[PDB]
Amino acid sequence: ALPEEVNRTLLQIVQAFQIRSVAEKALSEEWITENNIEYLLTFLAEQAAFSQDTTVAALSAVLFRKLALKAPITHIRKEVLAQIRSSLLKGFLSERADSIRHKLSDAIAECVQDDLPAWPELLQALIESLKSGNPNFRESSFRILTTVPYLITAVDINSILPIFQSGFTDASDNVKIAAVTAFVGYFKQLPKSEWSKLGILLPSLLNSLPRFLDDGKDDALASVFESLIELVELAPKLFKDMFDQIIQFTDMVIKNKDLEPPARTTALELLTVFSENAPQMCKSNQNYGQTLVMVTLIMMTEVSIDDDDAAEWIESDDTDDEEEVTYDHARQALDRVALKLGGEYLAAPLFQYLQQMITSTEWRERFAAMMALSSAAEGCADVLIGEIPKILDMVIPLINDPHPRVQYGCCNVLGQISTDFSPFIQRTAHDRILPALISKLTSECTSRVQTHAAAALVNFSEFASKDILEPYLDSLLTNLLVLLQSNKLYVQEQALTTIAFIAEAAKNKFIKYYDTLMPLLLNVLKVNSVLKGKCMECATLIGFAVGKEKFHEHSQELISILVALQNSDALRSYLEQSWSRICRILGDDFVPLLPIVIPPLLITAKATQDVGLIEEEEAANFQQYPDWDVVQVQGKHIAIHTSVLDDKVSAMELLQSYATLLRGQFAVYVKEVMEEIALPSLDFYLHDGVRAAGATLIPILLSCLLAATNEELVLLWHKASSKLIGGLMSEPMPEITQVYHNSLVNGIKVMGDNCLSEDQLAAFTKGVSANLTDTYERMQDDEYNENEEDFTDEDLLDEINKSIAAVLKTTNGHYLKNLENIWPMINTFLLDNEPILVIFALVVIGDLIQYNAFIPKVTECLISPDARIRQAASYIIGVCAQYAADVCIPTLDTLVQIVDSKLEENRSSTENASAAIAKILYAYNVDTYTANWFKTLPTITDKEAASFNYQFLSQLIEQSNISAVVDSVIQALNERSLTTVISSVKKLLGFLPSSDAMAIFNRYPADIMEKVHKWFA
């Protein structure tokens, strides 16, 4: 179909793939033009179809696929696309190698698009290929259906259903995998309105599963499981009436431990994932939780195979054995499910098993019981927090088990639950936990057990008071000093860390032990980077615990050693946090150490986005590394160095903390950090952590400059605010949008009055609109899915209200004009059924009056079942009578009723309504209305509301209510809601003889009476 000329030229080029680079240039610069692209695509499609050289055909098919997107295939003439399609199809039906038909299939897929004229030759080609006796023909057909799922819509329903049913049952496992892949792929690509069309085939798929176990093909079973895992995340309700069959089948696979791990782990994952996508379905079925618990407990047993003495486990690291895969999966599975379903559902089936396993003569079951409880403790905390002497009655007796890994196992529970059940367990079970853990620190126990007990002491210490730790400290430290003398490095390192965080909790109670520990620490440093890092961490944490004055006995020597260590990646982080910790200790005396500490932080915080314009094949190949991630922006892939950008964030966080502590002392760096680090970080579109860290950096930097000193502060703020504003109408992540608004408020708070210009205020209104528009759109968005986590929208709308309030305040009103442009959207929120948008709109209006067609909804919102809506509404009515009558006085008995309430959840609402009474009662000044308002006192939660109730109370002054008058003030002060009504009260007590005056305070205890006298005359 091409001139013989063009063929030899292009054949040479494709074959050449000095000689090669000349071909790559020739292709990309000469043969991808408006004048040559059609000839090239025609050529490559012919080579892929007809060439009998393996490499030429393969590359051409690959090249054709890539360049088909870029052209795009749409702008290709009719006569040539027809020839290209027909040649691709002819090559498909010919005899090609498996890999080439795969690449032909991928090439064919690029020629199917709603843009293009219909291609019914392909549909009929696929239908017959699916019946072919060659598995590769059947497999490749499903592959095309996977890449182009809309072809499934094109085939008649009575043809496509038998096709998949034949696919699920096919004698070839490659075909079955491809059939399942295509089936699931249909659901992840098409709208839900198309789902009830292949959905009826799920029973056929599930019924095909037992075949994999009969043929002994568990490897193919794992692949199908993974496809099923994806379907559960898309349409869990589809599994509802065959739920028990899924459960029993996964149970059967997992119990069969003659199978390999992949079939067993994927089966577990399938079971697990139901709890994350259909929690109500799991809870309405007792068989799920029982099976899940039973199956994970079996897998946790699989440890130390062919090693009953655990003589290999005793002799190794305190790191995890990477070979105990099924054990690891079982732990995470139980944890994940418990977190989703809660304690009240699966605490009982869990403990029904734990009671049994605790008494076994097989130590692996005794060990597993401890690990299971450790994994399930957090998710089941709502129940297990109450059964907290019960658990220790099982766990603590196992601490002295003959087998060391059961001992280790027992330490792990006490550690895990010290975190999950904090801070209540520290206050309640310190008498049982600490002696248990201490008894295992002794050197007669094996190294692994000492270390894990010491590790558990870190968990306990984190939320333990210094008063509780105090009588245990000496015994704790004498034991840990022994661990410090171990010949095993990981025992030494754990000893240092345990001591450090025991000291952190002990605080000033640790000054007792400074003189004996610090020289031992210095000795270690003077002579294993992990050791020295943990040692310096221990030294500085002790320093912050005992205080600056005590720390100064070794601080300079400690600092000199730090310098040697720094200029000599775990170590780098230990050194950074040590420097930062010393700054918290020394205060302003850290300033001379800034030239040492800051410059390396500056370098790391200036890292750019290490981007790699990447290509299809050599991706995923980069995904192996945890320090690399790849995403798609608009079609073309990219590869980004995530770790480098994570390090950037960590450095920015340290710079921010130094700036926060030092304040004015840090002003010298403000201009550099703002222009080279903070603001450029906002343009980091492939890492939202950097964007967030850059935003929070801004107000604190300006805060540093203001305290020290200005056109620079104004120029930097104008630059910072403008880029913050500009981010609002562009930022895709709603989470980041919240940070910018929050950053603006904090910035406005710092800069003060008149800090914004007319342009800025207008561009801010644009951003507010786009933020409100996209939030409304997302919130206005089941047969397949069960009915939150979306406080992201609420938190976003939260901060927006504070920015508007802040902007209104700094403009001193003149933002009223700009704010009218977005009232149409504001109005919709107020009159939308949905609570979050209602609350937002109400709060905005309240801030408006602060400086006709909304009163209808507000009065309706006054009696709302939601307290949040009543609070916002009451404030609006109250604020109306404040500095803006035909509505206030009529609603005045509505708010009487709303007041009558004093419950923690609704205490805030009834206190605003209360205050709303007091200023209707102030501007209009009824004496029975005031008597009603008086029994709403005192106001203890809302600060601004209480601030006024007592202001009014002092106006009504400057009978038998005198002790109700006083106590109303006492409770306000003591609850820290109000802060001189005191002056008024003292006068009321003055008009009484002293004996009657003093007896009012004859009901208050010493605590409050101490405050009362430092309050009154």
Binding site: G415, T419, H452, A456, E462
Partner: peptide, 5 residues
């Protein structure tokens, strides 16, 4: 040097 899942 702590205990975690």
């Amino acid at each position: 040097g702590s205990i975690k899942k």
